[PDB]
Amino acid sequence: GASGSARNDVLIGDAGNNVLNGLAGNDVLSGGAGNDVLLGDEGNDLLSGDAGNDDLFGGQGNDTYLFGVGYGNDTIYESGGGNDTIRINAGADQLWFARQGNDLEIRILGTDDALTVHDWYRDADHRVEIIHAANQAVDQAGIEKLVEAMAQYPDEFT
Ligand SMILES: [Ca+2]
Ligand SMILES: [Ca+2]
Ligand SMILES: [Ca+2]
Ligand SMILES: [Ca+2]
Ligand SMILES: [Ca+2]
Ligand SMILES: [Ca+2]
Ligand SMILES: [Ca+2]
Ligand SMILES: [Ca+2]
């Protein structure tokens, strides 16, 4: 358990199950190993769950969520912001996109690691706007499309 302030803070967990709350300001939150609960709150925050199964709450403002190979199975609960982003440490060639109920689900092909965006489909507030792969970026429209195409045909490398 670590708290920031209304200033811009840097919060780093350890290998246990941690709670990090940035409060207002533009914060960096890193969970490390274990199942962490990361709360950006107000401000433009940078959240990494790192290893383990992490719950990531960027909150209001435009938050950046890190994911990659070996990051386990993380869920984003967004609250608000017009330019929330996900940064993924793998090429667009190795991502898969699918809808699970109201959730958007991103898997890294042939690994275990999953990134879920809770209630993606339910309302705008819950959406993340841009996903950067290792050099490329697709937008909400591009995402909800790849989802449809990958579900229909695969034929995007089965
Ligand atoms: Ca913050
Ligand atoms: Ca802060
Ligand atoms: Ca941790
Ligand atoms: Ca973690
Ligand atoms: Ca935030
Ligand atoms: Ca946000
Ligand atoms: Ca993780
Ligand atoms: Ca958003």
Side-chain angles (χ1 to χ4, degrees):
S3 272
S5 44
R7 283 188 314 315
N8 306 333
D9 320 290
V10 189
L11 298 192
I12 160 74
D14 44 61
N17 295 350
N18 305 114
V19 171
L20 310 184
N21 175 36
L23 283 89
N26 296 341
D27 303 301
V28 185
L29 279 64
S30 190
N35 291 353
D36 301 298
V37 167
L38 279 64
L39 252 85
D41 201 296
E42 213 52 53
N44 304 315
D45 305 286
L46 197 235
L47 280 75
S48 190
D50 308 314
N53 291 2
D54 298 292
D55 292 316
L56 304 181
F57 304 87
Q60 300 293 338
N62 301 323
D63 309 293
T64 299
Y65 296 89
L66 308 183
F67 194 70
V69 169
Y71 266 59
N73 291 230
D74 292 355
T75 314
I76 301 179
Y77 307 82
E78 257 296 336
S79 288
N83 196 43
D84 299 298
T85 70
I86 294 170
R87 253 77 175 189
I88 302 171
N89 198 13
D93 35 286
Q94 59 184 132
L95 290 193
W96 204 266
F97 303 81
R99 162 181 194 161
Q100 205 63 62
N102 279 338
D103 299 348
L104 170 80
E105 182 195 57
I106 314 141
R107 290 179 295 201
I108 312 156
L109 289 169
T111 90
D112 269 286
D113 314 300
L115 184 59
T116 314
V117 183
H118 168 92
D119 276 3
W120 172 281
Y121 289 90
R122 216 182 55 63
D123 52 295
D125 272 349
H126 280 95
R127 276 187 283 276
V128 166
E129 289 68 40
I130 312 201
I131 309 189
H132 291 80
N135 46 218
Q136 215 205 299
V138 332
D139 68 341
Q140 278 175 42
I143 292 147
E144 180 50 7
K145 260 273 183 165
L146 277 162
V147 164
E148 289 184 296
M150 264 167 170
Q152 285 150 242
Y153 308 121
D155 281 3
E156 225 136 348
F157 297 110
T158 32

